């Protein structure tokens, strides 16, 4: 039960990215931009 | 026919353009604006990232 | 069990956005506006 900190942190960092992008996308509408380009 | 339509259809995309770039602002600023939760210095970061 | 605060907060922040938009949409009917434009 010493390494479990790293593990728990690893998973913390994962969901970090997730929220990061999730917001980054809301912030930078590349979806909307790209889509708009295609059509 | 082609000409007739390509003319009408072109103005329809030119309308879709601005109506769409709008969607882009509305999506991005509703996003930066969302920085009110974390500090106002967060807005500088957020809004710079966005606008 | 020190980093778990960040993790828990990360997830708090996620659902924050969610409710945020969820309401923001109820508030700004872009769905209805866009739809109305298309038809």
Swiss-Prot record, chains A, C:
Coiled coil residues, start to end: none
Post-translational modification: In outer membrane vesicles, the redox status prevents formation of the disulfide bond, leading to oligomerization and pore formation.
Source species, domain of life: Bacteria
Induction info: During anaerobic growth. Weakly or not expressed in most strains. It is activated by SlyA, while it is silenced by H-NS. Its expression is also regulated by CRP and FNR.
Compartment(s): Secreted; Periplasm; Host cell membrane
Family: Belongs to the hemolysin E family.
Function: Toxin, which has some hemolytic activity towards mammalian cells. Acts by forming a pore-like structure upon contact with mammalian cells.
Subunit composition and interactions: Monomer and oligomer. In periplasm, it is present as a monomer, while in outer membrane vesicles, it oligomerizes to form a pore structure that is active. The pore is formed by a dodecamer.
Identification of the protein by name: Hemolysin E, chromosomal
Organism lineage: Bacteria, Pseudomonadati, Pseudomonadota, Gammaproteobacteria, Enterobacterales
Full-sequence portion shown in this chain: 8 to 46 of 303
């Amino acid at each position: 039960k010493t390494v479990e900190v790293v593990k728990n942190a690893i998973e913390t960092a994962d969901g970090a990215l997730d929220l990061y992008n999730k917001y980054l996308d809301q912030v930078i509408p590349w979806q909307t931009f790209d889509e708009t380009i295609k059509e | 026919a082609l000409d007739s339509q390509l003319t009408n259809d072109f103005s329809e995309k030119s309308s879709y353009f601005q109506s769409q770039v709008d969607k882009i602002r509305k999506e991005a600023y509703a996003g930066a604006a969302a920085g009110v939760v974390a500090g106002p210095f967060g807005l500088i970061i957020s809004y710079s990232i966005a606008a």
